[PDB]
Amino acid sequence: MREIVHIQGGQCGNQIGAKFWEVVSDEHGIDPTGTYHGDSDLQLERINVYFNEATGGRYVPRAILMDLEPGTMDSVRSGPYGQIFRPDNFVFGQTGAGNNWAKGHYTEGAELIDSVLDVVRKEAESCDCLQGFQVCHSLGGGTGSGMGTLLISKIREEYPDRMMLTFSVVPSPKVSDTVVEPYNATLSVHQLVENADECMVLDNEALYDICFRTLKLTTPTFGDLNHLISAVMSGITCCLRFPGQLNADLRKLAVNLIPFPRLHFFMVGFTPLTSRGSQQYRALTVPELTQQMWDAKNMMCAADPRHGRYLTASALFRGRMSTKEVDEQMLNVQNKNSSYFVEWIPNNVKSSVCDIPPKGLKMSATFIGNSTAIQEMFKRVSEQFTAMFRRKAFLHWYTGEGMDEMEFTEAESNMNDLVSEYQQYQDASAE
Amino acid sequence: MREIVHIQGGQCGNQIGAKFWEVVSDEHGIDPTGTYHGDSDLQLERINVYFNEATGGRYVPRAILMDLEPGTMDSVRSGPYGQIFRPDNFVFGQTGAGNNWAKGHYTEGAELIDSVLDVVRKEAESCDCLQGFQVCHSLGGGTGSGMGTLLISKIREEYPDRMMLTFSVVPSPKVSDTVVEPYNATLSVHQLVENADECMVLDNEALYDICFRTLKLTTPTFGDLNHLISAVMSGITCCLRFPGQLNADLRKLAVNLIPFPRLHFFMVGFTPLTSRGSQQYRALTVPELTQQMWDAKNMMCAADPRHGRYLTASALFRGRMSTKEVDEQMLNVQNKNSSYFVEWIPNNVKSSVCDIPPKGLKMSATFIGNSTAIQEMFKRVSEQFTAMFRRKAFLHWYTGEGMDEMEFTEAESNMNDLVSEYQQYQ
Amino acid sequence: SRSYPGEQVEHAFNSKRLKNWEVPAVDKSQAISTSTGTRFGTLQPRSGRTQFIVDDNGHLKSGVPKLEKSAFNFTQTTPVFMDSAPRWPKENPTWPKNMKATMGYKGIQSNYLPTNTVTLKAVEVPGTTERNFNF
Amino acid sequence: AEEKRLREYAAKQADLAANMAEMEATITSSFMTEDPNMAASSMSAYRVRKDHY
Amino acid sequence: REVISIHIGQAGIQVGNACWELYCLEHGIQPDGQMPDAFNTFFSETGAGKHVPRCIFLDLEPTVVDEVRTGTYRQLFHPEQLISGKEDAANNFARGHYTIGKEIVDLALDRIRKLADNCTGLQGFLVFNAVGGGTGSGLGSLLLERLSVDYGKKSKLGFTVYPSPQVSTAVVEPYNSVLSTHSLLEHTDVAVMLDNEAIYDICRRSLDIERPTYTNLNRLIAQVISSLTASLRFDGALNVDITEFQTNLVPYPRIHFMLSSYAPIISAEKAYHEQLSVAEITNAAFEPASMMVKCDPRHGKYMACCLMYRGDVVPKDVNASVATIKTKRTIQFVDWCPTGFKCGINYQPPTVVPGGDLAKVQRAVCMISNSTAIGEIFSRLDHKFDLMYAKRAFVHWYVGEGMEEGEFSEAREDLAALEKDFEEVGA
Amino acid sequence: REVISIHIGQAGIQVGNACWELYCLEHGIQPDGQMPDAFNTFFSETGAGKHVPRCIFLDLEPTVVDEVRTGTYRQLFHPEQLISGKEDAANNFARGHYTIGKEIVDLALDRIRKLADNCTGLQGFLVFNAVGGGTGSGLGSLLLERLSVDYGKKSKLGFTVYPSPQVSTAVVEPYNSVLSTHSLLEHTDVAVMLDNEAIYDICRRSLDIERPTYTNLNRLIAQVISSLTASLRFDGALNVDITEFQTNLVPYPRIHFMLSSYAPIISAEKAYHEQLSVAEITNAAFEPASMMVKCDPRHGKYMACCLMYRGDVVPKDVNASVATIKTKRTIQFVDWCPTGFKCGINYQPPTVVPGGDLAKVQRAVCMISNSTAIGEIFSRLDHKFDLMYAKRAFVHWYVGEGMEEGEFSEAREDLAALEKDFEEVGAES
Ligand SMILES: Nc1nc2c(ncn2[C@@H]2O[C@H](COP(=O)(O)OP(=O)(O)OP(=O)(O)O)[C@@H](O)[C@H]2O)c(=O)[nH]1
Ligand SMILES: Nc1nc2c(ncn2[C@@H]2O[C@H](COP(=O)(O)OP(=O)(O)OP(=O)(O)O)[C@@H](O)[C@H]2O)c(=O)[nH]1
Ligand SMILES: Nc1nc2c(ncn2[C@@H]2O[C@H](COP(=O)(O)OP(=O)(O)O)[C@@H](O)[C@H]2O)c(=O)[nH]1
Ligand SMILES: Nc1nc2c(ncn2[C@@H]2O[C@H](COP(=O)(O)OP(=O)(O)O)[C@@H](O)[C@H]2O)c(=O)[nH]1
Ligand SMILES: [Mg+2]
Ligand SMILES: [Mg+2]
């Protein structure tokens, strides 16, 4: 019935989606070849949200990979669960953006976007009732940021009522791959704030910190960060795909977390996450889940929410759980540590329950907080953007392409006014 | 019962006519010897449309092959089903036209067309209730265009009542063999607009497009293009040869697709055409057929349809299916893409279903679209024609034969007024 | 249409007794102009002959007045109870929706066969118009 | 109702059979396999067909 | 009492192909032609142990006719009853009404004449056609013309299939339908509309067949015609003939169009859950969600209704249900028809067919009404004829056939007068 | 006699899943639909040997509905009465009242129409909804509006689930509850409040299940509904029908909000130890620690009260207990209501379900009262509605969905007028 169309942009986007589709296929029990071989019949009734029956139990995902160089597509094909994507959905150029947002938004976009729009429209009308689109991408690279952003804009022009999720990774200066990360991210966010329905801000800094501290893995390579992000996405969308005692779709979560149309940048967290040597010692209760959900070191954004106020928050639980305990944990975490919750919105915590656990567990939870500590990361980006734009460094790479300086000026102005609006919604009075 | 006399002109006509008779003789179960070897009874009652019983189960095709070089005849007899034709129907010159439309229309026709006309006239009175003629030729070469065109004019003069199809490939500046292509194409099109009942325009560029992108073939030689065109021909004629839930002959199609006497240039598509690397992922539902039917990358013409408006369209379905789904899919495609359809003709989609799928398949389809994006093709040809006619290049080859300049101007005027009226109806 | 008093059976033809259970039609029952005014009553006697209101073939003569367009119920002036369920082809959350088919998009228009992929060029000047199609 | 269920099940089984049969036929299809044996001519062992070569 | 049924068109004989399957099953006549006297209304009994229908399948394409000739009813369907031409009209009213009809009609007319001479108590004719096509519309109008001048006073029911508003199989079917109606005005006596779209709706709603073909449509159309001829065939507590809808449903000589409906159409499985009693099937036969024509009687006013009942029906509750309907105000009648109903009861329950999708029921209702939502249909169909004729589209086909524009203008103005007729009569 | 039940929302049809299980177990109906005549007020005897309930589950998400369709009561719960949409209203009264309601409500009410036509002696409709959600609020209100315009004077008993003061699952539920109440005012005949933390407290304190789910709550709600329809279903010494609460609890056309209470909700061994009699259960049905709504009637004045008794109850002791309650001054009545009670007695003891947590008991009391603690509740809710409304939070959702600010203002001021009225009624003068 309700349909989620998945879109992946760029190399990080492609690999995030690879792990995500692995997890989803494993959850629904389809084999790496692409045929159903599960046991319980709860798995068949809600795979229309993600797949399409081809021939005798053959389900292919409702996904659109998009890139600019065939290396990513071939790395997708080579991996397990790599033969289930339909080759028609492999749209890809041959030049490569090369960490150039201008190249991703004006030169190659102008002639790749129409083909990718054809593909996305075909896979959108291949189903009956869209829930929405779900795009995964980065804000550092070019072929993901610029191309995916132009795609988002065109999609919001075409289909203005269906929902839109953007799982975006943002750069943060402690781990800085590229040099033009602010030039990319500022323009991308300036476009997001008027196109995207809601955004979840991930960060490799936070992912690495979590894998070091909580999991205590020795070598936490990008595979494990991708698995964490995929766990987050599956915990987001579990409500559609499995029945429960209190369901909550993407539109429901958006309407309960977004109090104003421009305030849609959330920080995410997942529970439980512990080492295999430390899983022997810990207890396993809903309080044990919530103490780790609300812990500030568990947020997948590199921003301490203790430095600001929670505007709204949402929790999605998976597993057979007692709604009494769910409600009272939420109640006490709201009441006790009460300074971190805003005043002019009482009962800030939306919650939902589903009875099917993620693969490998008995109970789990996903937290989505719309806080006002995200203006911290926005300021950290804008300050580097100012530092560069003062001296006009790296500017020719964009200016010799069709872009002008007023684009940068407008991006700066929008970023600054957004952080101002976040600041004064934090510092608003009750009456 | 209702009869189709087939006609092939020139090298291109002979080769696609070869593949065409291979596919048809196969679906009717006729062996390369000429004897029936099918299994069902449903095939026998509708072979008089294409064949004639000669001697004890010997069915020979009702075809006429006309050309000007024996290389075509050897290429006809080289393949299998090469000895199933009739040597009397091999009416054929000896000199060769050679990319000269006037040679195909004035010097060689004057001595060839009488014998071809004798053959086709005897082949016309051989059947009782003739339905119409089928013509397959090219618009680039000389012996196909000129000679076939003159036969078109003569036939329409003798039998002005029956139906008439024309499968014509047209030259393109993107895949171009010869340089006098516009000179031949413009004159032939100029004659087709007054004589032909309707024309279904093919193009080798779009065919290479299909074979490269959809099929993902490595070396799509002419044999494959001829087979795709053959797949189109079988689809356009399935209604006469097999019973179904709703039949629609050629005349029923022309009535439902031609609103104006000069607007008879259709673009054609054919489904299903999926690459064998991606056949494991397909589903087999009339949704999957119509998504490939209305797809712009599946037209066999080099015209982007959504640059203009569909005037009328038709869908010919083969296979056991549900009319409910067929009719509501046509309902959806008309209501969603509301801008791409013309406004003063509601219900632009004719549909028909025939319960017998082609051999080896369970469900197929054929699309015939009368759009106004065809004026892109003709403008693309007319501009090169003007570019050449300004300086009068390559004109002596024609004017030295009897043709004069007013034929070229008349060719320009009808091409321009035609494109002007398509642009008007857009 | 009007429902007349039966004087013996209307006690059994009360709408509530017929399992109607809704607010019944009393339009049909006020148009009678009975003596008591309720459904229990006696009609008025009539005398004389009825002249022809209508012309032939059912067209009202010019002199007699009529309600302007009374054969139909327009949506602007209909009440809320006279509302119908939507039929099939209109989309509704109850019955499933079949897919729609959308005009595709031919590839990037170049001088050779259009494709869905852009290539690296060897020569790039703003006015290059110079490609390498063969692979 | 039981009869209708049985008929539906048989119809679905046969639909799957025909589906797989078409799949196999068109995968082993001469085009999708690009058979050069189709280029052979009938009236010689040396000369080849002009189109399918 | 015998009634002969003619089928003009590719839809017509496909409807007859399901209808006659139902007749032979209901009278227990094996398809080879003999049983292992109610049959006398349909099957003439020749010689000894042989029953040949009173019908003519006539068409222009030989394909579906000789498909009948080669099926299993070679012996039942008789040789000269299956008239077939040589070439089609091809969705062209002119071609089917002036060129080809002139050769097929004399043969069909002098066949049916000797069928009528075989008959003794001829009740009437009933015609089956789709007005969207060329064969059904063109020579259909010509046959009805010559039938009216030959017999005239006998009743001629017509169960036509009009083009649906939004879903369509052809393009020129507005022209064909308008020119067909323009003669169906003064030729048929009672015309019954049967739109394919509403039947697709019904199959989806109640039979929950997600993917029906034309057969399921043909099968339940046969249920309807059988349900309104069963009074002639079998004895009932209150029988009503075929000459009656003549009188009780056509108030004015040019308003003869009927919105048909039927209930209960029900699946094999929903039958277990639902009780089918006389009150609820009389209610369910009045909802627009169970009508055979895609329109809405709530938008208009009922002129008159007929109610055929089959099976386990006693008179008290058909009288109670009609009373309830009268007291309900979701429906309303015109103000010039105080007595707006006609009941009719028959004893035989409707039969089921092997391979059909309908369940076995105790009782059923076939409601045939007359309203002003038909004026709504003609107007919506009038608009899309007005679009295409504004730009002179497709006109060259008809004129090239040999007709002129007087027929176009007079057919459009005749419909305009018909719209005034509905608007004024309903006042 | 018959009474048909409509269930609007994800809470509505879970409550229904508990209630119909209770009904089948009370009337001995197997889940396949047939017995191994009092059932005729809930189950219509279709044909021969089959009962299809007089209810309609309607919902916008297909999940829970086709979960029911796949569950244990496949054959019993009928195929076409379970109405299920395709996409949710998503905690959005506007979406459920203008966008999707206007396409689902006509089919819903044309099902109700033929249910009522099948009916013979209709008592009234009873509706089950939670006003916190999108569906149960929006198309709940739309359905009640069109039912009130189509039927008018019939009884519509609305057992609504309001949001709890401190325990909350949603955020926009103040907007939802206000905009739902604004029409629940003038369309519901008698409304009964059912909060959730109150029942959590009951199950935590009395039934001592330390970890309950929604199912135990739904079981208690089903017990209440059964206890107030048992007078229709089973014969009693003094039976009272549905049309009476209409008359005997609503003194003014806008004051219909009933505090519900039930006693004894007692666990299996507290029951073994305690001795049960009419006097102490009548005492227990009046203390705030046994009510179904999180409020305190000590602060208010009882305007009227109705008491259903079930089981081994004779009129003598109920009269004695009511007398003692009236003489004691712990609870007071409004001055202009000197006869503030309405007793009713039914013979059959409340039945028990295997797996249910309530012990089997010889007698029970269900009180449907009226007070001004509800006027306290509505002000407590208006507080946190005006909080979020002063900054125009979340409003863009509704306005882009199709409402405007005038409706917000009129709902707020309508609740303000209701507050003034609840103040004015309690004054003695
Ligand atoms: N209800 C129903 N309609 C049918 C059936 N078969 C064909 N039709 C309708 O018939 C109309 C077109 O006419 P056809 O039956 O195809 O052929 P025709 O009526 O003889 O007209 P020609 O094609 O010119 O010969 C379409 O609107 C179809 O919907 C059927 O089996 N059932
Ligand atoms: N008492 C009680 N309340 C419930 C139950 N189930 C859900 N709720 C309440 O339902 C409210 C939210 O609305 P839902 O019923 O979940 O969903 P809805 O009403 O259909 O609204 P949508 O989410 O838009 O579909 C919350 O306040 C829950 O407390 C239940 O079993 N018992
Ligand atoms: N979590 C995660 N981050 C990645 C992955 N691949 C690249 N990144 C991050 O993405 C940033 C640059 O993105 P980039 O590779 O340029 O995106 P592109 O435009 O698709 O090439 C770097 O800081 C990387 O740390 C991945 O697989 N997972
Ligand atoms: N599709 C297709 N195109 C052909 C074939 N043979 C020739 N052509 C095209 O037609 C043009 C030459 O036409 P030609 O055969 O010389 O015409 P003719 O001499 O009059 O028969 C070339 O541009 C070819 O691309 C064929 O068998 N199939
Ligand atoms: Mg026909
Ligand atoms: Mg809900």
At A348, is the secondary structure helix, strand, or coil? coil
Question: Cβ of E427 and C81 within 8 Å?
Answer: no
Is E218 annotated in a binding site? The answer is yes
Nearest residue to E388 (alpha-carbon basis) of E139, E98, E173: E173
Establish if F60 touches chain C: CB-CB under 8 angstroms. Answer: yes
C19 touches chain E (CB under 8 A): yes
Solving technique: cryo-EM
As beta bridge partners, residue F7 has F57, F128
Interchain pair C25, E327: CB under 8 A: yes
CA gap B334, B326 in Å, rounded:
13
User: Which one of the listed residues F244, F287, F401, F407 is annotated catalytic?
Assistant: F244
F338: preceding bond cis by omega (within 30 degrees): no
Q: Which residue, judged by its Cα, is nearest atom 18 of ligand 3?
A: A141
* Residues A405-418 as b or e (16 or more Cβ within 10 Å = b): eebbeebbebbeeb
A325–chain F Cβ distance below 8 A for any pair: yes
Flag whether A204 is marked binding: yes
CA dihedral F222, F224, F228, F229 (to 10 degrees): 10
Taking the CA of A185 as reference, the closest ligand is 3
Torsion sign over Cα E282, E283, E286, E290:
negative
Through-space distance between the first and last CA atoms of chain E, rounded to whole angstroms: 39
Q: How far apart are CA F133 and CA F89, in angstroms?
A: 8
The conformational region for residue E418 under phi > 0 = left, psi -120 to 50 = alpha, else beta, is alpha
Q: Looking at the DSSP assignment, which residues form a beta bridge with residue E191?
A: E158, E257
Between CA F315 and CA F343 the distance in angstroms is 9
Question: How many Å apart are CA F408 and CA B424, to the nearest integer?
Answer: 53
The DSSP element (H or E) to which A310 belongs, if any, is strand A310-318
Contact E353, E226 (CB under 8 A): no
Q: Chain A contact for D16, CB < 8 A? A: yes
Integer angstrom CA distances of residue B162 from B8, B130, C76, C105, E87: 18, 7, 55, 38, 11
Find out whether the beta carbon of B184 lies less than 6 Å from any atom of ligand 4.
no
Token readout for E414 is: 């005749």
**CB A201, CB A377: distance < 8 Å:** yes
Phi first, then psi: give them for residue A231, nearest 5 degrees.
Answer: -60, -40
Structure tokens at E255: 């308003």
CA distance E394 to E172: 8
* Residue of F121, B21, A59 whose CA lies nearest to C21: F121
Does the beta carbon of D3 sit less than 6 angstroms from any atom of ligand 4? no
CB contact residues (below 8 A), chain F span 18-57, against chain E: 44-47, 50, 52
For atom 24 of ligand 4, the residue with the nearest CA is: B177
- Whether the CB-CB separation of F351 and F23 falls below 8 Å is answered with no
Integer CA distances (angstroms), F162 to B8, B240, E25, F135, F140, in order? 81, 69, 61, 14, 13
Nearest CA in chain E to B251: E90
Q: How would you label C52-75 residue by residue, b for 16+ Cβ within 10 Å and e otherwise?
A: eeeeeebeeeeeeeeeeeebbbee
Q: Contact C1/E422, CB-based, under 8 Å?
A: no
Residue E306: how many other CB atoms lie within 10 Å: 21
Q: Do A255 and F170 touch (CB under 8 A)?
A: no
Q: Which residue of D has its CA nearest to B364?
A: D22
**From the CA of D2, how many Å to the nearest CA of chain B?**
23
Q: Flag whether residue A300 sits within 8 Å of chain F, measured between CB atoms.
A: no
Q: Which of A184, A198, A195 is nearest to A265 (CA)?
A: A198
Sheet containing E122-130: order of strands: E82-84, E55-59, E2-8, E122-130, E155-161, E190-193, E257-263, E363-370, E304-311, E343-346
Q: How far is CA A321 from the centre of its chain?
A: 26
**CA distances for B184 relative to B102, B190, B196, B384, F315, angstroms:** 9, 10, 17, 12, 111
Cβ(E29)–Cβ(E141) below 8 Å? no
Ligand 4 mean position, distance from CA B12 (Å): 4
CA distance linking residue E99 with residue E399, whole number of Å = 12
Is F134 annotated for ligand binding?
Answer: yes
F218, F155, F233, F162: which is closest to F194 by C-alpha?
A: F162
The whole-angstrom separation of Cα F262 and Cα F286 is 9
Q: What per-residue string of b and e applies to B108-127 under the rule 16 or more CB within 10 Å gives b?
A: bbeebbeebbebbeebbeeb
Report the candidate in E137, E119, E118, E121 with the shortest Cα–Cα distance to residue E129: E137
Beta carbons within 8 Å of F378's beta carbon, 6+ residues apart: F181, F415, F418, F419, F422
Using CA coordinates, name the residue in chain C closest to E322. Answer: C18
Chain-centroid distance, C-alpha D22: 6
What phi and psi values does residue A228 have, to the nearest 5 degrees? -60, -45
Residue E360 to residues B406, D1, E265, E309, Cα–Cα distance (Å): 78, 11, 10, 15
Which distant-in-sequence residues (6+ apart) come within 8 Å of A46 by Cβ? A240, A241, A242
Judged by DSSP in three states, E6 sits in strand
Candidates E253, E423, E426; nearest CB to C57: E253
Please report, as a single letter, which amino acid is at residue F185: L
| Residue of E64, E67, E91 lying closest to B255 (CB–CB) | E91
Extract the tokens encoding F367: 């009180």
Question: Read out DSSP for C73-126?
Answer: --TTT--SSS-PPP-SSS--SSS------------B--SSS-BS-----S---T
F14 is in an annotated binding site: no
Sign, Cα dihedral of E363, E366, E371, E377:
positive
- For residue A272, cis peptide bond before it (omega within 30 degrees of 0): yes
Output the six-digit token pair for F251: 């003194």
Contact B337, C102 (CB under 8 A): yes
CA-to-CA separations, A359 to A34, A229, A230, F148, in angstroms, rounded? 18, 15, 12, 50
The position carrying tokens 């609870």 is F331
HEC letters along A14-34: HHHHHHHHHHHHHHHCECCCC
- What DSSP designation does A88 have? G
Q: E117 and chain F: CB distance < 8 Å anywhere?
A: no
Instruction: Determine contact, residues E378/E415, Cβ cutoff 8 Å.
Output: yes
Q: How far apart are CA A98 and CA F237, in angstroms?
A: 88
Instruction: Provide the pairing of β-strand A265-271 with A364-371.
Output: antiparallel
- Return the residue of D nearest to E359 by Cα: D1
Rounded CA separation F173/F178 (Å)? 8
